[PDB]
């Protein structure tokens, strides 16, 4: 159901914005250290099956968040698994946690803006 799909995408989008806003708008004395870690990034992310590329990075994501999260990542894991239904292709450029979260937020907004 394109309906249920968008409540899950809206839910996935919110969870990612919660993490972004929690490391952007927050004291964070570990920000500089957290920012050193590099995330693998999707070569292309336009179909829901490309969420495979997000799932594979959930374990490093949780680890980085721990340096300042299990519940949020586990909640995200369930939604990704529901939405994705392949072989992830990664770009060569790697990204900081903020660039990583921004890319997948943008991805959700692209997909949310194609079923409504």
């Amino acid at each position, epitope marked *: 159901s394109t309906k249920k799909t968008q409540l899950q995408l809206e839910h996935l989008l919110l969870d990612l914005q919660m993490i972004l806003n929690g490391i952007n708008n927050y004291k964070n004395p570990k920000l*500089t250290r957290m920012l*050193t*870690f*590099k995330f*693998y990034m999707p070569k292309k992310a336009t179909e829901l099956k490309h969420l495979q590329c997000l799932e594979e990075e959930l*374990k*490093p994501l949780e*680890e980085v968040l721990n340096l300042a999260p299990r519940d949020l990542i586990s909640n995200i894991n369930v939604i990704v698994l529901e939405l994705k239904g392949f072989m992830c292709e*990664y*770009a*060569d*450029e*790697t990204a*900081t946690i903020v660039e990583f979260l921004n890319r997948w937020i943008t991805f959700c907004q692209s997909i949310i803006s194609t079923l409504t």
Partner: single-chain antibody
Amino acid sequence: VQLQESGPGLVAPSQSLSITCTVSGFSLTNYDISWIRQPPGKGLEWLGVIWTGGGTNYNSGFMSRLSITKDNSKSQVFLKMNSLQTDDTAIYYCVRQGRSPYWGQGTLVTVSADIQVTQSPSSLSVSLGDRVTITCKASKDIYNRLAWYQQKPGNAPRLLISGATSLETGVPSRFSGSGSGKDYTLTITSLQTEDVATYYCQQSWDTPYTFGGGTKLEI
């Protein structure tokens, strides 16, 4: 894509070591740059990195005498090292630290007179057609940030596998990587003469980006 190291050749301990890494085919605004060195008869060691966005991280054993800087407009990265001693004699490489790291040629500098990575075995005497397994165990989870390199004497390391399991284009199907969290394996099937070399793993999850001790494969 090219990274070209320009160094002094021979330096006295009274002077500082200055090496310029000039890059082509990509922008320093898009990639982190690491510096590596390899002493004459020894393995590889990671010296430091300058992040895409400007800051740096240095190996704790060098952090008081090392300086890495860069000029985004000129596509150049600069290494400066002071308090030189004879053991700073080494081939110095700059590395584009993307998912599949891209290495410079390396330049030899001669001075005038932490996640541990356990790689096993250190040496392998073997025969053609054989299949060999080299293991690279990390002291912590490294989330597949593990590369395998093949080195023949007189040449820079060649990237075989990146991201634990991704075979680099141009590298024969005989090579494969596997592993998941702490334990990673390189497997070479149908051993051929062109595989005689020393193999190294490197983790790039957390700094310092440490190498394994090497596996020398001789037939």
